[PDB]
UniProtKB/Swiss-Prot annotation, chain A:
Interacts with SSK2, SSK22 and YPD1. The keyword Cytoplasm applies. It is found in: Cytoplasm. The phosphorelay mechanism involves the sequential transfer of a phosphate group from 'His-576' (H1) to 'Asp-1144' (D1) of SLN1, then to 'His-64' (H2) of YPD1 and finally to Asp-56 (D2) of SSK1. Disruption phenotype: Increases arsenite sensitivity. It comes from the Eukaryota. Its main location: cytoplasm. This is Osmolarity two-component system protein SSK1. The lineage of its organism: Eukaryota, Fungi, Dikarya, Ascomycota, Saccharomycotina. The gene is SSK1.
UniProtKB/Swiss-Prot annotation, chain B:
It is found in: Cytoplasm; Nucleus. It comes from Saccharomyces cerevisiae (strain ATCC 204508 / S288c). Interacts with the response regulatory domains of SLN1 and SSK1. The modification Phosphohistidine is found at residue 62. This is Phosphorelay intermediate protein YPD1. GO terms for cellular component: cytoplasm; nucleus. SUPFAM superfamilies: Histidine-containing phosphotransfer domain, HPT domain (SSF47226).
Length: 145, 152
Protein backbone atom coordinates (compact mmCIF):
# COMPACT_ATOMS: atom_id res chain seq x y z
CA UNK A 1 0.00 0.00 0.00
CA UNK A 2 0.89 3.71 -0.12
CA UNK A 3 2.39 5.33 2.97
CA UNK A 4 2.35 9.08 3.66
CA UNK A 5 5.62 11.01 3.53
CA UNK A 6 5.75 12.03 7.20
CA UNK A 7 8.50 12.30 9.80
CA UNK A 8 8.20 9.88 12.72
CA UNK A 9 9.81 9.71 16.17
CA UNK A 10 9.81 6.47 18.18
CA UNK A 11 10.82 6.75 21.84
CA UNK A 12 11.64 3.55 23.74
CA UNK A 13 14.09 2.71 26.53
CA UNK A 14 15.40 -0.42 24.76
CA UNK A 15 17.56 -0.34 21.64
CA UNK A 16 16.20 -3.74 20.58
CA UNK A 17 12.67 -2.32 20.60
CA UNK A 18 13.96 0.69 18.66
CA UNK A 19 15.48 -1.55 15.98
CA UNK A 20 12.21 -3.45 15.50
CA UNK A 21 10.08 -0.35 14.93
CA UNK A 22 12.86 1.33 12.97
CA UNK A 23 13.10 -1.66 10.63
CA UNK A 24 9.45 -1.21 9.66
CA UNK A 25 9.91 2.50 8.95
CA UNK A 26 13.13 1.87 7.01
CA UNK A 27 11.47 -0.86 4.94
CA UNK A 28 8.74 1.58 3.83
CA UNK A 29 11.11 4.55 3.28
CA UNK A 30 9.73 6.55 6.23
CA UNK A 31 12.08 9.18 7.65
CA UNK A 32 12.46 8.81 11.40
CA UNK A 33 14.56 9.62 14.45
CA UNK A 34 15.28 7.69 17.64
CA UNK A 35 14.97 8.90 21.24
CA UNK A 36 16.21 7.17 24.40
CA UNK A 37 13.99 8.86 26.99
CA UNK A 38 11.39 11.60 27.28
CA UNK A 39 13.84 14.48 27.63
CA UNK A 40 15.39 13.55 24.28
CA UNK A 41 11.92 13.34 22.72
CA UNK A 42 11.12 16.90 23.80
CA UNK A 43 14.48 18.16 22.54
CA UNK A 44 14.11 16.32 19.22
CA UNK A 45 10.57 17.67 18.83
CA UNK A 46 11.89 21.20 19.39
CA UNK A 47 14.00 20.72 16.25
CA UNK A 48 10.75 20.74 14.26
CA UNK A 49 9.57 18.69 11.31
CA UNK A 50 7.90 15.90 13.28
CA UNK A 51 4.43 14.67 12.33
CA UNK A 52 3.91 11.46 14.33
CA UNK A 53 5.45 10.36 17.64
CA UNK A 54 5.29 6.80 19.00
CA UNK A 55 6.24 7.28 22.63
CA UNK A 56 6.39 4.86 25.55
CA UNK A 57 4.68 6.11 28.70
CA UNK A 58 7.37 4.81 31.08
CA UNK A 59 10.80 6.28 30.29
CA UNK A 60 13.99 6.50 32.39
CA UNK A 61 14.75 10.21 32.71
CA UNK A 62 11.43 11.89 31.82
CA UNK A 63 8.24 9.85 31.54
CA UNK A 64 6.31 9.84 28.28
CA UNK A 65 3.34 11.33 30.14
CA UNK A 66 5.29 14.41 31.23
CA UNK A 67 7.00 14.65 27.83
CA UNK A 68 3.61 14.65 26.09
CA UNK A 69 2.29 17.30 28.47
CA UNK A 70 5.48 19.31 27.93
CA UNK A 71 5.01 19.13 24.15
CA UNK A 72 1.33 20.10 24.34
CA UNK A 73 2.16 23.04 26.60
CA UNK A 74 4.86 24.27 24.22
CA UNK A 75 2.42 24.00 21.31
CA UNK A 76 -0.08 26.25 23.08
CA UNK A 77 2.56 28.90 23.82
CA UNK A 78 3.47 29.05 20.11
CA UNK A 79 -0.15 29.13 18.94
CA UNK A 80 -0.56 25.53 17.78
CA UNK A 81 -3.85 23.69 18.22
CA UNK A 82 -2.54 33.87 5.37
CA UNK A 83 0.19 35.56 7.41
CA UNK A 84 1.83 32.31 8.55
CA UNK A 85 0.74 28.81 7.57
CA UNK A 86 -1.11 27.00 10.35
CA UNK A 87 1.33 24.41 11.69
CA UNK A 88 -0.67 21.38 12.75
CA UNK A 89 -0.11 19.84 16.20
CA UNK A 90 2.10 16.77 16.27
CA UNK A 91 0.36 13.41 16.59
CA UNK A 92 1.45 11.43 19.65
CA UNK A 93 0.65 7.71 19.86
CA UNK A 94 1.31 6.37 23.35
CA UNK A 95 2.81 2.93 23.98
CA UNK A 96 0.81 1.59 26.92
CA UNK A 97 1.40 -1.44 29.13
CA UNK A 98 -2.03 -3.11 28.88
CA UNK A 99 -5.36 -2.58 27.11
CA UNK A 100 -7.17 -1.35 30.23
CA UNK A 101 -9.25 1.83 30.26
CA UNK A 102 -6.99 3.32 32.96
CA UNK A 103 -3.97 2.98 30.69
CA UNK A 104 -6.01 4.54 27.87
CA UNK A 105 -7.30 7.54 29.84
CA UNK A 106 -3.84 8.24 31.27
CA UNK A 107 -2.60 8.62 27.69
CA UNK A 108 -5.61 10.63 26.48
CA UNK A 109 -5.57 12.98 29.49
CA UNK A 110 -1.84 13.57 28.89
CA UNK A 111 -2.36 14.88 25.35
CA UNK A 112 -1.85 11.74 23.26
CA UNK A 113 -4.01 11.24 20.18
CA UNK A 114 -4.06 7.42 20.17
CA UNK A 115 -2.51 4.45 21.97
CA UNK A 116 -0.85 1.10 21.27
CA UNK A 117 -0.27 -1.71 23.76
CA UNK A 118 3.16 -3.29 24.23
CA UNK A 119 4.69 -5.34 22.74
CA UNK A 120 3.96 -3.15 19.73
CA UNK A 121 2.17 -5.04 16.96
CA UNK A 122 3.78 -4.24 13.61
CA UNK A 123 0.45 -4.64 11.83
CA UNK A 124 -1.13 -2.27 14.35
CA UNK A 125 1.88 0.05 14.04
CA UNK A 126 1.26 0.17 10.28
CA UNK A 127 -2.44 0.98 10.65
CA UNK A 128 -1.69 3.85 13.04
CA UNK A 129 0.74 5.38 10.53
CA UNK A 130 -1.81 5.33 7.70
CA UNK A 131 -4.75 6.40 9.87
CA UNK A 132 -2.97 9.46 11.29
CA UNK A 133 -0.30 10.14 8.67
CA UNK A 134 -2.63 10.19 5.66
CA UNK A 135 -4.87 12.76 7.39
CA UNK A 136 -1.84 15.05 7.62
CA UNK A 137 -0.82 14.43 4.00
CA UNK A 138 -4.26 14.47 2.34
CA UNK A 139 -7.19 16.87 2.67
CA UNK A 140 -10.49 15.57 4.09
CA UNK A 141 -9.11 12.02 4.39
CA UNK A 142 -11.55 10.39 6.82
CA UNK A 143 -9.71 7.59 8.61
CA UNK A 144 -12.88 6.86 10.61
CA UNK A 145 -14.62 5.81 7.37
CA UNK B 1 0.13 -18.06 34.21
CA UNK B 2 3.34 -18.71 32.27
CA UNK B 3 2.71 -19.35 28.55
CA UNK B 4 2.94 -22.93 27.32
CA UNK B 5 5.16 -22.20 24.29
CA UNK B 6 8.67 -20.76 24.36
CA UNK B 7 8.34 -18.73 21.14
CA UNK B 8 5.30 -16.67 20.13
CA UNK B 9 5.77 -17.01 16.38
CA UNK B 10 2.89 -14.61 15.69
CA UNK B 11 5.06 -11.79 17.05
CA UNK B 12 8.36 -13.11 15.67
CA UNK B 13 7.20 -13.99 12.14
CA UNK B 14 6.40 -10.35 11.36
CA UNK B 15 9.97 -9.55 12.41
CA UNK B 16 11.32 -12.35 10.20
CA UNK B 17 9.07 -10.98 7.44
CA UNK B 18 11.53 -8.04 7.29
CA UNK B 19 14.51 -10.32 6.52
CA UNK B 20 13.85 -10.15 2.77
CA UNK B 21 15.63 -6.82 2.22
CA UNK B 22 17.89 -6.80 5.31
CA UNK B 23 19.22 -10.36 5.17
CA UNK B 24 19.77 -11.99 8.58
CA UNK B 25 18.21 -8.97 10.29
CA UNK B 26 16.10 -11.01 12.72
CA UNK B 27 19.15 -13.15 13.50
CA UNK B 28 21.02 -9.96 14.38
CA UNK B 29 18.30 -9.01 16.86
CA UNK B 30 18.47 -12.46 18.48
CA UNK B 31 22.25 -12.18 18.81
CA UNK B 32 21.76 -8.66 20.17
CA UNK B 33 19.21 -9.98 22.68
CA UNK B 34 21.47 -12.79 23.90
CA UNK B 35 24.12 -10.19 24.72
CA UNK B 36 21.45 -8.06 26.43
CA UNK B 37 20.01 -10.94 28.46
CA UNK B 38 23.44 -12.12 29.61
CA UNK B 39 24.31 -8.56 30.65
CA UNK B 40 20.94 -8.07 32.36
CA UNK B 41 21.25 -11.40 34.19
CA UNK B 42 24.74 -10.40 35.36
CA UNK B 43 23.43 -7.06 36.65
CA UNK B 44 20.65 -8.88 38.52
CA UNK B 45 23.17 -11.36 39.95
CA UNK B 46 25.49 -8.49 40.91
CA UNK B 47 22.75 -6.94 43.06
CA UNK B 48 21.70 -10.19 44.77
CA UNK B 49 25.25 -11.06 45.85
CA UNK B 50 26.13 -7.38 46.33
CA UNK B 51 24.24 -4.18 47.10
CA UNK B 52 20.50 -4.89 47.21
CA UNK B 53 18.18 -2.36 45.54
CA UNK B 54 14.74 -3.77 44.75
CA UNK B 55 13.94 -0.71 42.61
CA UNK B 56 16.85 -1.62 40.33
CA UNK B 57 15.76 -5.26 40.18
CA UNK B 58 12.32 -3.84 39.36
CA UNK B 59 13.88 -1.84 36.51
CA UNK B 60 16.16 -4.67 35.35
CA UNK B 61 13.18 -7.00 35.00
CA UNK B 62 11.23 -4.29 33.17
CA UNK B 63 14.14 -3.67 30.79
CA UNK B 64 14.50 -7.28 29.65
CA UNK B 65 10.73 -7.83 29.56
CA UNK B 66 10.22 -5.20 26.87
CA UNK B 67 12.76 -6.79 24.53
CA UNK B 68 11.92 -10.46 25.13
CA UNK B 69 8.20 -9.76 24.66
CA UNK B 70 8.76 -7.84 21.42
CA UNK B 71 10.77 -10.81 20.07
CA UNK B 72 8.03 -13.31 20.95
CA UNK B 73 10.00 -14.85 23.84
CA UNK B 74 6.95 -15.21 26.06
CA UNK B 75 8.37 -17.27 28.93
CA UNK B 76 11.37 -14.97 29.41
CA UNK B 77 9.08 -11.93 29.46
CA UNK B 78 6.76 -13.73 31.89
CA UNK B 79 9.48 -14.45 34.46
CA UNK B 80 10.78 -10.89 34.03
CA UNK B 81 7.32 -9.63 35.00
CA UNK B 82 7.46 -11.88 38.07
CA UNK B 83 10.81 -10.39 39.11
CA UNK B 84 9.23 -7.03 38.30
CA UNK B 85 6.39 -7.53 40.80
CA UNK B 86 8.58 -9.23 43.41
CA UNK B 87 10.72 -6.10 43.62
CA UNK B 88 7.54 -4.03 44.00
CA UNK B 89 6.36 -6.21 46.94
CA UNK B 90 3.27 -7.12 44.88
CA UNK B 91 3.89 -10.90 44.79
CA UNK B 92 5.03 -13.27 47.52
CA UNK B 93 5.55 -16.65 45.81
CA UNK B 94 7.48 -17.95 42.80
CA UNK B 95 6.86 -21.60 41.81
CA UNK B 96 9.65 -24.14 41.51
CA UNK B 97 11.31 -25.24 38.28
CA UNK B 98 9.64 -28.66 38.06
CA UNK B 99 6.26 -26.90 38.25
CA UNK B 100 7.12 -24.39 35.50
CA UNK B 101 8.67 -26.89 33.07
CA UNK B 102 5.53 -29.04 33.30
CA UNK B 103 3.58 -26.29 31.49
CA UNK B 104 5.34 -26.87 28.15
CA UNK B 105 2.98 -28.10 25.43
CA UNK B 106 5.70 -30.20 23.78
CA UNK B 107 7.32 -32.17 26.60
CA UNK B 108 10.29 -33.47 24.56
CA UNK B 109 12.21 -30.26 25.31
CA UNK B 110 13.46 -30.88 28.85
CA UNK B 111 16.00 -33.66 28.20
CA UNK B 112 18.91 -31.92 29.94
CA UNK B 113 20.06 -30.84 33.38
CA UNK B 114 18.98 -27.51 34.89
CA UNK B 115 21.87 -25.79 36.69
CA UNK B 116 16.18 -11.07 58.71
CA UNK B 117 15.54 -7.73 57.02
CA UNK B 118 12.26 -6.59 55.46
CA UNK B 119 13.46 -7.65 51.99
CA UNK B 120 15.06 -11.05 52.71
CA UNK B 121 12.01 -13.05 51.60
CA UNK B 122 11.64 -11.25 48.26
CA UNK B 123 15.36 -11.37 47.43
CA UNK B 124 15.24 -15.17 47.70
CA UNK B 125 12.27 -15.21 45.31
CA UNK B 126 14.13 -12.89 42.92
CA UNK B 127 17.24 -15.07 43.19
CA UNK B 128 15.02 -18.09 42.55
CA UNK B 129 13.31 -16.38 39.60
CA UNK B 130 16.59 -15.14 38.08
CA UNK B 131 17.73 -18.77 37.97
CA UNK B 132 14.44 -19.74 36.31
CA UNK B 133 15.18 -17.01 33.76
CA UNK B 134 18.46 -18.77 32.96
CA UNK B 135 16.62 -21.98 32.06
CA UNK B 136 14.02 -20.17 29.96
CA UNK B 137 16.89 -18.26 28.32
CA UNK B 138 18.70 -21.50 27.46
CA UNK B 139 15.52 -23.13 26.14
CA UNK B 140 14.90 -20.12 23.88
CA UNK B 141 18.45 -20.25 22.53
CA UNK B 142 18.02 -23.95 21.71
CA UNK B 143 14.67 -23.28 20.02
CA UNK B 144 15.99 -20.31 18.03
CA UNK B 145 19.14 -22.23 17.08
CA UNK B 146 17.07 -24.94 15.39
CA UNK B 147 15.07 -22.38 13.41
CA UNK B 148 18.02 -20.33 12.15
CA UNK B 149 20.10 -23.53 11.67
CA UNK B 150 22.99 -21.79 13.45
CA UNK B 151 24.57 -22.15 16.88
CA UNK B 152 22.62 -19.41 18.72
Amino acid sequence: KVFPKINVLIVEDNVINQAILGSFLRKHKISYKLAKNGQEAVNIWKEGGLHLIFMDLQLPVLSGIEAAKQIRDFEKQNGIGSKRFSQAPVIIVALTASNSQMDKRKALLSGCNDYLTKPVNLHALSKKITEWGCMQALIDFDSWK
Amino acid sequence: TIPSEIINWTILNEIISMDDDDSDFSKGLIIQFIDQAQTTFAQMQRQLDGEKNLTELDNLGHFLKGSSAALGLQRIAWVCERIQNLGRKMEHFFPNKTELVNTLSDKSIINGINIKDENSIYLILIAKALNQSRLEFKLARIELSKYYNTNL
